[PDB]
């Protein structure tokens, strides 16, 4: 719905950026998550170890609750840490059964809450 929300969905089903501008949200969101992913690989390694059970079993409701709860007080860099996590979780659950971003709408709602701050971090502060 919002420009940020539309971009999260787009990113979550890796739509593939054409036309990148320094202020294209999808591209810059995408760049921020690839940067977080690489720089915190080992951490995502741990995070997978913790969630393997939920992913192998295809336990959507738990995964959703887990992340929503994580998002509660969240600062912009955890919200983006969370979206990066979710991207990779989405991809992994597809091996099992069709999973797309809508299944996680409420998580997205929590990653995009307080827009100005999240965008502020993406453009100004992410790298």
């Amino acid at each position: 719905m919002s420009r940020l929300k539309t971009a999260v969905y787009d990113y979550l089903n890796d739509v593939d950026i054409t036309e990148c501008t320094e202020m294209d949200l999808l591209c810059q969101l995408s760049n921020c998550c690839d940067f977080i992913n690489e720089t915190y690989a080992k951490n995502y390694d741990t995070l997978y170890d913790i969630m393997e059970r939920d992913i192998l079993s295809y336990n959507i409701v738990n995964i959703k609750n887990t992340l929503t709860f994580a998002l509660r007080d969240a600062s912009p860099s955890v919200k983006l840490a969370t979206l990066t996590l979710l991207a990779s979780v989405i991809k992994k659950l597809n091996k099992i059964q069709h999973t797309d971003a809508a299944m996680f709408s409420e998580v997205i709602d929590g990653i995009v809450a307080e827009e100005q701050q999240v965008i502020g971090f993406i453009q100004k502060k992410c790298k």
Binding site: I36, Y40, N43, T46, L47, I50, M51, R53, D54, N62, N65, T66, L67, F69, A70, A74, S75, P76, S77, V78, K79, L80, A81, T82, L85, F121, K125
Partner: peptide, 25 residues
């Protein structure tokens, strides 16, 4: 549970090496 405390722990960590490390001191 403790599974969801963990994830939460781990996400805060990452976002602390971020929004704290390369931000202000």
């Amino acid at each position: 549970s403790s599974t969801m405390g963990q994830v939460g722990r781990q996400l805060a960590i990452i976002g602390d090496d971020i929004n704290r490390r390369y931000d202000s001191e």
